[PDB]
Design a protein around this ligand. Structure first.
Ligand SMILES: CCCCCCCCO[C@@H]1O[C@H](CO)[C@@H](O)[C@H](O)[C@H]1O
Lengths: 108, 107
């Protein structure tokens, strides 16, 4: 009966090998699935980051335009400060000069 | 026959050892991918909070700039009305001068 014990032990090893193989298949599949998920999360991360970077880029464009116009307006304002000052010098010159003639003829 | 039997038992046992090491390898790699996944989720949330902070900072900057723009415009408008006034005055004086000049012309 010893040899029979050995034989039924061979059917036992068969059984165990089958089971271990099924486990290996299951684990390969699970590995696939997990990798899949990892990749889709890489995708989601790229989505998130890209969307935020875009909205930031829109706003930054607004800051660029605004800074631009601001600079233009300030430059214009400096030119007009200049023109204004010239006009004021001229005015005061003509005014003082006239008034000198007037005061003279009244007072001489 | 002895040989064939020793061989069957032995190659079965060794096949089992083999299978058990690859099961361990696989479980280890699944653990790896799960940790990577965890890191990825944390990195997503992180990217979100970072992005939102950036948006907020940029919006504050822009708001300040809009206010600065409005102020510069008002400065310029004040300057322009002042210039209009000044010019009117100067034109009056010009009138006086041109009258005296036209006087010298006829002589
Ligand atoms: C070169 C452009 C200069 C034009 C500036 C116009 C004045 C700014 O704009 C106006 O200012 C008024 C008084 O501050 C406000 O009543 C208005 O709400 C505002 O639109």
């Amino acid at each position: 009966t010893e040899i029979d014990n050995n034989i039924e032990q061979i059917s036992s090893y068969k059984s165990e090998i089958t089971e271990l193989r099924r486990n290996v298949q299951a684990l390969e599949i699970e590995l696939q699935s997990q990798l899949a998920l990892k990749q889709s999360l890489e995708a989601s991360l790229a989505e998130t980051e890209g969307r935020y970077a875009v909205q930031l880029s829109q706003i930054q464009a607004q800051i660029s335009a605004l800074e631009e116009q601001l600079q233009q307006i300030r430059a214009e304002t400096e030119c007009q400060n200049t023109e204004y000052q010239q006009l004021l010098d001229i005015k005061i010159r003509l005014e003082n000069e006239i008034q000198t003639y007037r005061s003279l003829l009244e007072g001489e | 026959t002895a040989g064939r039997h020793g061989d069957s038992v032995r190659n079965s046992k060794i096949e089992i050892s083999e299978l058990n090491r690859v099961i361990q390898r696989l479980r280890s790699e699944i653990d790896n991918v799960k940790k990577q996944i965890s890191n990825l989720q944390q990195s997503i949330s992180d990217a979100e909070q970072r992005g939102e902070n950036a948006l907020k900072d940029a919006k504050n900057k822009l708001n300040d700039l809009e206010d600065a723009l409005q102020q510069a415009k008002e400065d310029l408008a004040r300057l322009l009305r002042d210039y209009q006034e000044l010019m009117n005055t100067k034109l009056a004086l010009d009138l006086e001068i041109a009258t005296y000049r036209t006087l010298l012309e006829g002589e």
